[PDB]
Amino acid sequence: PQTSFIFDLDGTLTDSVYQNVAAWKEALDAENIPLAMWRIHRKIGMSGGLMLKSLSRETGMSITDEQAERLSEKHAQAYERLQHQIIALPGAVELLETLDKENLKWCIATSGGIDTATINLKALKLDINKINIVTRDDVSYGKPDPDLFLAAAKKIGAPIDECLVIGDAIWDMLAARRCKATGVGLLSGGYDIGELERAGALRVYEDPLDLLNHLDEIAS
């Protein structure tokens, strides 16, 4: 039973978490919701809605639908302005190329909407509508809800239990475990080995190259 692959995008295949953080920071500052950047970095990988609720509750207050919407817009705009900073992570393309050449099926699964996802894909010189990908616009709920991964397993014709989830955030690992998939964590999104293991990572690697070099430990 050959392994099928569900990849997170931002922080996992492209070096874009820190741009995402900066974009949220600028949006939140614009809206007088001053939050230290480590707290924003902690939530990267959740869909914006859940992230906003989450930061909200942890600061003791709550954010209306209307401001959530504006924060979202501000975030997309700030991200766009940072689009050319985004580079593919080491091994990322080579890993994807390895899988195709090997007939292993993979899908991308991101809490980002079509906009962010199109930007990061450029860095991997990939055309969105030419690959297997699921976005926040494809489901009701983002990470850590299992929705995205389930839709991804479905898009590639693999049972979710024949799947390996690859992610850089607590939220990817959490969602992986919630649908009982096998989760593997990458350090390239800035989360540490401790956090990723506690959120359910079975193995943790530096980046796609490191993972590629150990593909046997973890995939068939």
Which amino acids are annotated as binding site for Ca(2+), given as ranges? Answer: 8, 10, 168, 190
- Residue from 16, 18, 27, 45 that binds Ca ion (CB under 5 A)? 45
What b/e sequence results for 118-152 when a residue is b if at least 16 CB atoms lie within 10 Å of its CB, and e otherwise? Answer: bbbbebbebeeeeebbbbbebbeebbbbbbbbbbb
What, of a second copy, Ca ion, none, does residue 8 touch, CB below 5 to 8 Å by kind? Ca ion
Distances (CA, A) of 205 to 96, 187, 188, 191, 199: 16, 6, 9, 11, 15
What, of Ca ion, a second copy, none, does residue 193 touch, CB below 5 to 8 Å by kind? a second copy
Task: Tell me, rounded to whole angstroms, the distance of Cα 77 from its chain centroid.
Answer: 19
Site for a second copy, residues 26 to 85, rule: CB under 8 A: 34, 36-38, 41, 85
Does 18 sit near a second copy (CB under 8 A)?
yes
d(CA 187, CA 190): 6
Amino acid at 207: D
What, of a second copy, Ca ion, none, does residue 36 touch, CB below 5 to 8 Å by kind? a second copy
Q: Which residue has the tokens 């010189």?
A: 125
Residues tagged in the binding site annotation: 8, 10, 168, 190
Stretch touching Ca ion by CB under 5 A, among 11-19, 78-86, 115-123, 199-207: 11-19
Q: Which positions from 80 to 119 touch a second copy by CB under 8 A, shown as an x/- string?
A: -----x-x-xx-----------------------------
CA 113-119-121 angle, 5° bins: 95
Stretch touching a second copy by CB under 8 A, among 16-24, 73-81, 109-117, 133-141: 16-24
What, of a second copy, Ca ion, none, does residue 15 touch, CB below 5 to 8 Å by kind? a second copy
The 3-state DSSP class for residue 89 equals: coil
Does 8 sit near Ca ion (CB under 5 A)?
yes
Stretch touching a second copy by CB under 8 A, among 11-19, 48-56, 61-69, 133-141: 11-19
Do residues 14 and 86 touch, judged by C-beta distance below 8 A? yes
Say whether the peptide bond before residue 144 is cis (omega within 30 degrees of 0): yes
Do residues 134 and 152 touch, judged by C-beta distance below 8 A? yes
Q: Which residues bind a second copy (CB under 8 A)?
A: 15, 17-18, 21-22, 25, 34, 36-38, 41, 85, 87, 89-90, 187-195, 207
Q: Which residues bind Ca ion (CB under 5 A)?
A: 8, 10-11, 45, 168-169, 190
